């Protein structure tokens, strides 16, 4: 019944095939799709938003969308995606302690929203030392962190952002900062990149909104040609590799007051001693927009800047 407490139709100005914005044939396809899944005895994740994400990923080919959804449900159960938040909460102290070890080296933080109300997400790669990374974490651990974030996005960020926007929010506005990376390191982590792409595209269809790659070094175009082969055409269409004019491009999409100063905006933490890489600021922290789902857990424990 949580779905009844936030908007379940997108902005009328959203992309085709989104909730509330369907053609008659798309409406009929959705009804047929839900009917097949109900008949197969699925009960959860049958809402308009979820099912239309799958339909869009397979161009409203109902049989292909069924195969995709069924396989996703299989994965969620086998992997533990259905209990990942609960499992984290039951081992919070230990998991937080480990997460904080990586935060400074690999900043990953949400910070308000874009102009459409999408959670605004930043990740910085240039401080990563691969040798040190491999000694404090594992690839599988990082993939767990990704899956846990997808679940937190869906249970906490979506409801609050949708209530604020006045319409359903389904996707992220992401900024990936590559300032200071070595292209050698980039090639070395290709298999990890593929694992992220595989989980994202197979089990979390249509979660990408905007994906900006900034401060990429010369020669990044070459490296990205090793990534493209395992990205679906729709995925490629969401990724924008920006140049020296990146600040101007970000400002078309993101309110100036929501963009950190170093990226050309005016956003500054309230205590300038606080760190962005421990921060989690957005509508999901505002009592006005938190609903029956409750407030998101603090991913950086006591260090979490809210």
The DSSP annotation for the chain comes to -GGGGS--S--TTS-TTSTT---HHHHHHHHHHHHHHHHTT--SS-SHHHHHHHHHHTTT-HHHHHHHHHHHHHHHHHHTGGGHHHHHHHTHHHHHHHHHHHHTTS-EEEEEE-TT-PEEEEEE-TT--HHHHHHH--HHHHHHHHHHHHHHIIIIIHHHHHHHHTS----EEEEEE-TT--HHHHHHTHHHHHHHHHHHHHHSTT-EEEEEEESPPTTHHHHHTTTGGGS-HHHHHTEEE--TTHHHHHHHHS-GGGSBGGGTS-B--SSTTS-GGGB-BSGGG-TTT--TT-PPP-TTGGG-B-
Handedness of CA 79, 138, 299, 242 (dihedral sign): negative
Resolution (in Å) of the shown entry?
Answer: 1.8
Residues of the chain with CATH 1.10.8.20: 1-79
Q: What is the C-alpha to C-alpha distance for residues 127 and 136, in angstroms, rounded to an integer?
A: 15
Using alpha carbons only, give the angle 109, 120, 164 rounded to the nearest 5 degrees.
Answer: 120
80-306: CATH topology is Phosphatidylinositol Transfer Protein Sec14p (3.40.525)
What is the total residue count of the chain? 306
Q: What is the CATH number of domain 1-79?
A: 1.10.8.20
Q: What is the C-alpha to C-alpha distance for residues 231 and 201, in angstroms, rounded to an integer?
A: 8
Burial 236-251 (b: 16+ CB within 10 A, else e): eebbeebeeebeeebe
Residues 6+ apart with CB under 8 A from 210: 114, 118, 171, 172, 173, 174, 238, 240, 253
Residues of the chain with CATH 3.40.525.10: 80-306
Alpha carbon of 257 to those of 162, 192, 251, 269, 279: distances in Å? 20, 34, 10, 11, 16
Using alpha carbons only, give the angle 236, 240, 245 rounded to the nearest 5 degrees.
Answer: 165
**Residue 101 CB neighbour total at 10 angstroms:** 11
Q: Largest Cα–Cα distance in the chain?
A: 56
Q: How far is residue 145 CA from its own chain's centroid?
A: 12
Sheet of strand 172-177: strand arrangement = 108-113, 119-124, 172-177, 208-214, 239-241
Identify the residue whose tokens are 């679906």. 232
């Amino acid at each position: 019944s949580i779905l009844d407490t936030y908007p379940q139709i997108c902005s009328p100005n959203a992309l085709p095939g989104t909730p509330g914005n369907l053609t008659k044939e798309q409406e009929e396809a959705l009804l047929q799709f839900r009917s097949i899944l109900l008949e197969k005895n699925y009960k959860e994740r049958l809402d308009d938003s979820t099912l239309l994400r799958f339909l869009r990923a397979r161009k409203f080919d109902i049989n292909a969308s069924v195969e995709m959804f069924v396989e996703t449900e299989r994965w969620r159960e086998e992997y533990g995606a259905n209990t990942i938040i609960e499992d984290y909460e039951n081992n919070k102290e230990a998991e937080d302690k480990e997460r904080i070890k990586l935060a400074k080296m690999y900043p990953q933080y949400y910070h308000h929203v874009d102009k459409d109300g999408r959670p605004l997400y930043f990740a910085e790669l240039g401080g990563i030392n691969l040798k040190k990374m491999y000694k404090i974490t594992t690839e599988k651990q990082m993939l767990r962190n990704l899956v846990k974030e997808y679940e937190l996005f869906a249970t906490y960020r979506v409801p609050a952002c949708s209530r604020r926007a006045g319409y359903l929010i389904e996707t992220s506005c992401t900024v990936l900062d590559l300032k200071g990376i070595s292209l050698s390191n980039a090639y070395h982590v290709l298999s990890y990149i593929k694992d992220v792409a595989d989980i994202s595209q197979n089990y979390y269809p249509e979660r990408m909104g905007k994906f900006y790659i900034i401060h990429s070094p010369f020669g990044f175009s070459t490296m990205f040609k090793m990534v493209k082969p395992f990205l679906d055409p729709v995925t490629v269409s969401k990724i924008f590799i920006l140049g020296s004019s990146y600040k101007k491009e970000l400002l078309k999409q993101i309110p100036i007051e929501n963009l950190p100063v170093k990226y050309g905006g005016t956003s500054v933490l309230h205590n300038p001693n606080d760190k962005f890489y421990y921060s989690d600021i957005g509508p999901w922290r505002d009592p006005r927009y938190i609903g029956p789902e409750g407030e998101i857990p603090n991913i950086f424990g006591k260090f979490t800047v809210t």
